[PDB]
Design an enzyme around this catalytic site. Structure first.
Site, PDB file in Angstrom:
ATOM      1  N   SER A 149      77.884 -26.576 109.359  1.00 53.39           N
ATOM      2  CA  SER A 149      77.473 -27.884 109.886  1.00 53.39           C
ATOM      3  C   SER A 149      78.145 -28.975 109.058  1.00 53.39           C
ATOM      4  O   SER A 149      79.386 -28.982 108.980  1.00 53.39           O
ATOM      5  CB  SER A 149      75.944 -27.934 109.923  1.00 53.39           C
ATOM      6  OG  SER A 149      75.504 -28.865 110.893  1.00 53.39           O
ATOM      7  N   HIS A 153      71.740 -23.116 116.124  1.00 49.06           N
ATOM      8  CA  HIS A 153      72.416 -23.751 115.005  1.00 49.06           C
ATOM      9  C   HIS A 153      71.749 -23.346 113.705  1.00 49.06           C
ATOM     10  O   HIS A 153      70.526 -23.470 113.569  1.00 49.06           O
ATOM     11  CB  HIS A 153      72.337 -25.266 115.195  1.00 49.06           C
ATOM     12  CG  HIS A 153      73.120 -26.057 114.192  1.00 49.06           C
ATOM     13  ND1 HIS A 153      74.501 -26.088 114.180  1.00 49.06           N
ATOM     14  CD2 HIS A 153      72.714 -26.892 113.207  1.00 49.06           C
ATOM     15  CE1 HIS A 153      74.909 -26.894 113.215  1.00 49.06           C
ATOM     16  NE2 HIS A 153      73.844 -27.401 112.615  1.00 49.06           N
ATOM     17  N   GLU A 180      74.197 -23.802 119.900  1.00 47.13           N
ATOM     18  CA  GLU A 180      74.231 -24.838 118.862  1.00 47.13           C
ATOM     19  C   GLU A 180      73.276 -26.001 119.147  1.00 47.13           C
ATOM     20  O   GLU A 180      72.610 -26.511 118.234  1.00 47.13           O
ATOM     21  CB  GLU A 180      75.651 -25.398 118.728  1.00 47.13           C
ATOM     22  CG  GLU A 180      76.690 -24.420 118.209  1.00 47.13           C
ATOM     23  CD  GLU A 180      76.560 -24.207 116.719  1.00 47.13           C
ATOM     24  OE1 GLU A 180      75.569 -24.707 116.109  1.00 47.13           O
ATOM     25  OE2 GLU A 180      77.437 -23.510 116.167  1.00 47.13           O
ATOM     26  N   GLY A 218      73.309 -30.057 106.779  1.00 46.48           N
ATOM     27  CA  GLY A 218      72.125 -30.887 106.837  1.00 46.48           C
ATOM     28  C   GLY A 218      72.402 -32.310 107.302  1.00 46.48           C
ATOM     29  O   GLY A 218      71.685 -33.245 106.918  1.00 46.48           O
ATOM     30  N   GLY A 219      73.437 -32.493 108.116  1.00 47.56           N
ATOM     31  CA  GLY A 219      73.719 -33.808 108.665  1.00 47.56           C
ATOM     32  C   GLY A 219      74.139 -34.857 107.653  1.00 47.56           C
ATOM     33  O   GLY A 219      74.067 -36.046 107.962  1.00 47.56           O
TER      34      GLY A 219
HETATM   35  C1  WXN Z   1      74.892 -32.693 112.624  1.00 43.73           C
HETATM   36  N1  WXN Z   1      73.729 -32.191 111.911  1.00 43.73           N
HETATM   37  C2  WXN Z   1      72.586 -32.983 111.740  1.00 43.73           C
HETATM   38  C3  WXN Z   1      72.540 -34.321 112.091  1.00 43.73           C
HETATM   39  C4  WXN Z   1      71.360 -35.085 111.902  1.00 43.73           C
HETATM   40  C5  WXN Z   1      70.215 -34.554 111.371  1.00 43.73           C
HETATM   41  C6  WXN Z   1      70.193 -33.214 110.993  1.00 43.73           C
HETATM   42  C7  WXN Z   1      69.185 -32.341 110.410  1.00 43.73           C
HETATM   43  C8  WXN Z   1      67.752 -32.661 110.017  1.00 43.73           C
HETATM   44  N2  WXN Z   1      66.719 -32.641 111.166  1.00 43.73           N
HETATM   45  C9  WXN Z   1      66.686 -34.014 111.792  1.00 43.73           C
HETATM   46  C10 WXN Z   1      67.043 -31.621 112.223  1.00 43.73           C
HETATM   47  C11 WXN Z   1      66.807 -30.157 111.733  1.00 43.73           C
HETATM   48  C12 WXN Z   1      67.274 -29.031 112.683  1.00 43.73           C
HETATM   49  C13 WXN Z   1      68.596 -28.354 112.224  1.00 43.73           C
HETATM   50  C14 WXN Z   1      69.057 -27.076 112.939  1.00 43.73           C
HETATM   51  C15 WXN Z   1      68.478 -25.795 112.348  1.00 43.73           C
HETATM   52  C16 WXN Z   1      66.976 -25.667 112.669  1.00 43.73           C
HETATM   53  C17 WXN Z   1      66.134 -26.799 112.068  1.00 43.73           C
HETATM   54  C18 WXN Z   1      66.133 -28.021 112.918  1.00 43.73           C
HETATM   55  C19 WXN Z   1      69.798 -31.093 110.281  1.00 43.73           C
HETATM   56  N3  WXN Z   1      71.136 -31.141 110.749  1.00 43.73           N
HETATM   57  C20 WXN Z   1      71.396 -32.448 111.186  1.00 43.73           C
END
Ligand code: WXN
Ligand SMILES: *[C@@H]1O[C@H](CO[C@@H]2O[C@@H](C)[C@@H](O)[C@@H](O)[C@@H]2O)[C@@H](O[C@@H]2O[C@H](CO)[C@@H](O)[C@H](O)[C@H]2NC(C)=O)[C@H](O)[C@H]1NC(C)=O
Ligand SMILES: *[C@@H]1O[C@H](CO[C@@H]2O[C@@H](C)[C@@H](O)[C@@H](O)[C@@H]2O)[C@@H](O[C@@H]2O[C@H](CO)[C@@H](O)[C@H](O)[C@H]2NC(C)=O)[C@H](O)[C@H]1NC(C)=O
Ligand SMILES: *[C@@H]1O[C@H](CO[C@@H]2O[C@@H](C)[C@@H](O)[C@@H](O)[C@@H]2O)[C@@H](O)[C@H](O)[C@H]1NC(C)=O
Ligand SMILES: *[C@@H]1O[C@H](CO[C@@H]2O[C@@H](C)[C@@H](O)[C@@H](O)[C@@H]2O)[C@@H](O)[C@H](O)[C@H]1NC(C)=O
Ligand SMILES: *[C@@H]1O[C@H](CO[C@@H]2O[C@@H](C)[C@@H](O)[C@@H](O)[C@@H]2O)[C@@H](O)[C@H](O)[C@H]1NC(C)=O
Ligand code: NAG
Length: 527
Positions: A196, A436, A323, A114-115
């Site tokens: 992630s 991703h 990804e 989740g970043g």
């Molecule tokens: C490297 N990671 C990452 C970085 C920054 C923000 C996020 C987020 C939150 N938001 C902004 C994007 C959500 C998406 C993730 C990918 C799976 C499908 C949903 C959309 C999830 N990961 C992140």
């Protein structure tokens, strides 16, 4: 009634029916003092014993975090949003154990992604009951602090030292070491896995000396610390803390007085200002994440990796075919989950500005030059697919391959996969491909549930993946030895063999994204 005496007191579980069998779930065991009041931003403190029977019969609070409101009512985004109340009181973990109670079961510990700004262990796609039921492993998952509440950093200052959410994870691994044998688990056989930011976290536990004795093996799905989003420099981290201070009215001269001011702010005030601590963010912005704190992380992790300063053990690493596509609809112009997102050359160039805002002009043309030499200039999806590949190769695939090369050069067995199956239930559009995050449900065995509208081919793919993951955890070798499967060879830095995961033919290939990753790993860092 299933009660277990842990070292802090008795916990009560509940029984689950799974595939005509039983799994015992302990949902919401606290593993740390709630980090409230004077404890906000500090490292997690050890939990005090209780004398009652703690009822672990419900997922606990998720940690405070901003929610994705980009597609209200859309399951493709909202399935990642928290499904329990947000609260600073969120340092809880979950345990699924096979029934009947195993004798010395291998333990899988999940660290969600989740970043480093979002995520929770209670998500449906992280439900450990299928793994426990099918492979008789014990599954553990924990909530850890995210965002500024988990990673705010004035390095060297213990009121906000950085890496708190990583220490949350660590305290939870410590909980498994001290307590899992009472659940029938084997603390000498613990495998971390995550996706992630969770995978990036796993990779940093391999680097942190305080984690080395808390686990055996590691699985890294779509992430590693050398990803460009995964570690904040001391400089940015300080500038970001100070910017948060200015935005909240907490600018002081005494650094401790800043933290104390930030301690009387409501979590929502902190969350609201989190996005603006950087001048130009991207859809992939990680505003508050791991830093070199001199505690969890004793040096810049690239240096530790390059010079062999990490836990010597086996790793399983991999990535998904597409990804990068998910992030394109969070800001790239001309992109939409609701049309086929055919973009022009100019829109592609604009997209590079969105994803590489502080990169020089020359740097951005160098991306364009290496991703737009067409096999066919007239294909209209050429630019749409190039931008996804740019984002995906730079942010996930090439760092994961580079991590695996460097890790394996010090003598350890490593196994690399390329997941290329698009879930038949994927609610996102087809142009986004194998996104991703959408291997997770296969790893957790959700397609083994016949009621859940997956195809038969997907049930079989998940069954084989579940077995490979369990065999890697138990034995260090992700083979499926019974059903005449393709043998998964070790990844070596010379030949770089990897295994493709799909419903058709599972294949051995070599040198994933060779040309693209030479650009990102040996050119682009110089721009
Ligand atoms: C490297 N990671 C990452 C970085 C920054 C923000 C996020 C987020 C939150 N938001 C902004 C994007 C959500 C998406 C993730 C990918 C799976 C499908 C949903 C959309 C999830 N990961 C992140
Ligand atoms: C380090 O931070 C400064 C300050 O950021 C500004 O103030 C914060 C409180 C927050 O509100 C940010 O969004 C602000 O941008 C950055 O300085 C700014 O830089 C931009 C572009 O470089 C410029 O247009 C602004 O006028 C600057 N603002 C100030 C107050 O100087 C600086 O860029 C940051 N350093 C890095 C490397 O990103
Ligand atoms: C694909 O959609 C994007 C997004 O635009 C929105 O979503 C559409 C599905 C529709 O509901 C539109 O009314 C919405 O605006 C389109 O991007 C927009 O394109 C116009 C003109 O081309 C431009 O002025 C806007 O700035 C764009 N907005 C964004 C956010 O990019 C895009 O053109 C569509 N592409 C195709 C091939 O259909
Ligand atoms: C803890 O649980 C005790 C056992 O009762 C079980 O849990 C409750 C929630 C019901 O579902 C009941 O049918 C179960 O058998 C409770 O008696 C006790 O009140 C609970 N303690 C607290 C503090 O809530
Ligand atoms: C449980 O098993 C312990 C040995 O664990 C072994 O080594 C690790 C690395 C794992 O890979 C695991 O599969 C192996 O079996 C014993 O030392 C311990 O005494 C056992 N305890 C009980 C209660 O069975
Ligand atoms: C293995 O396959 C099972 C069903 O396939 C049957 O068993 C194999 C050994 C062959 O004889 C084949 O022709 C049969 O149809 C599945 O039920 C089972 O889940 C699979 N196991 C794994 C780990 O993938
Ligand atoms: C800031 O104030 C605190 C009082 O709570 C004090 O302990 C600390 O030494 C001060 N730091 C500086 C740099 O003045």
């Amino acid at each position: 009634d299933i009660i277990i005496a842990t070292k802090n007191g008795k916990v009560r579980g509940m029984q689950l029916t799974v595939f005509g069998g039983t799994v015992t779930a302990f949902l919401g065991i606290p593993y740390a003092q709630p980090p409230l009041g004077r404890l906000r931003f500090k490292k997690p403190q050890s939990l005090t014993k209780w004398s009652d029977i703690w009822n672990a019969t419900k997922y606990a609070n998720s940690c405070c975090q901003n929610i994705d409101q980009s597609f209200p009512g859309f399951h493709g985004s909202e399935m990642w949003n928290p499904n329990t109340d947000l609260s600073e009181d969120c340092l809880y973990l979950n345990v699924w154990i096979p029934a009947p109670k195993p004798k010395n079961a291998t333990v899988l510990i999940w660290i969600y992604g989740g970043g480093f700004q979002t995520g929770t262990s209670s998500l449906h796609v992280y439900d450990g009951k299928f793994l426990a039921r099918v492979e008789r492993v014990i599954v553990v998952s924990m909530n850890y602090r995210v965002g500024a509440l988990g990673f705010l950093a004035l390095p060297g200052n213990p009121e906000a030292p950085g890496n708190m959410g990583l220490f949350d994870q660590q305290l939870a691994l410590q909980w498994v070491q001290k307590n899992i044998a009472a659940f029938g688990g084997n603390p000498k056989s613990v495998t971390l896995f995550g996706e992630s930011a969770g995978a990036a976290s796993v990779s940093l536990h391999l680097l942190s000396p305080g984690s080395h004795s808390l686990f055996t093996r590691a699985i890294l799905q779509s992430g590693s610390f050398n990803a460009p989003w995964a570690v904040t420099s001391l400089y940015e981290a300080r500038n970001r803390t100070l910017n948060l201070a200015k935005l909240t009215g907490c600018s002081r001269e005494n650094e401790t007085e800043i933290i104390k001011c930030l301690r009387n702010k409501d979590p929502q005030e902190i969350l609201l200002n989190e996005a603006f601590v950087v001048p130009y963010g991207t859809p992939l912005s990680v505003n508050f994440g791991p830093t070199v704190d001199g505690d969890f992380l004793t040096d810049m992790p690239d240096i530790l990796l390059e010079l062999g300063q990490f836990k010597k053990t086996q790793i399983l690493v991999g990535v998904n075919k597409d990804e990068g596509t998910a992030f394109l609809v969070y800001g790239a112009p001309g992109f939409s989950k609701d049309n086929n997102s055919i973009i022009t050359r100019k829109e592609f160039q604009e997209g590079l500005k969105i994803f590489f805002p502080g990169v020089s002009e020359f740097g951005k043309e160098s991306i364009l030059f290496h991703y737009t030499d067409w096999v066919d200039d007239q294909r209209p999806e050429n630019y749409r697919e190039a931008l996804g590949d740019v984002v995906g190769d730079y942010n996930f695939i090439c760092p994961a391959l580079e991590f695996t090369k460097k890790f394996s050069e010090w003598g350890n067995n490593a196994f690399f996969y390329y997941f290329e199956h698009r879930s038949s239930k994927l609610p996102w559009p087809e142009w986004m491909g194998v996104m991703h995050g959408y291997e997770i449900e296969f790893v957790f065995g959700l397609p083994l549930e016949r009621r859940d509208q997956y195809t038969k081919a997907e049930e079989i793919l998940s069954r084989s993946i579940v077995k490979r993951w369990a065999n890697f955890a138990k034995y260090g070798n992700p083979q499926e030895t019974q059903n005449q499967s393709t043998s998964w060879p070790v990844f070596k830095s010379t030949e770089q063999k990897y295994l493709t995961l799909n419903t058709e033919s599972t294949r051995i290939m070599t040198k994933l994204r060779a040309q693209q990753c030479r650009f990102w790993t040996s050119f682009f860092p110089k721009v």
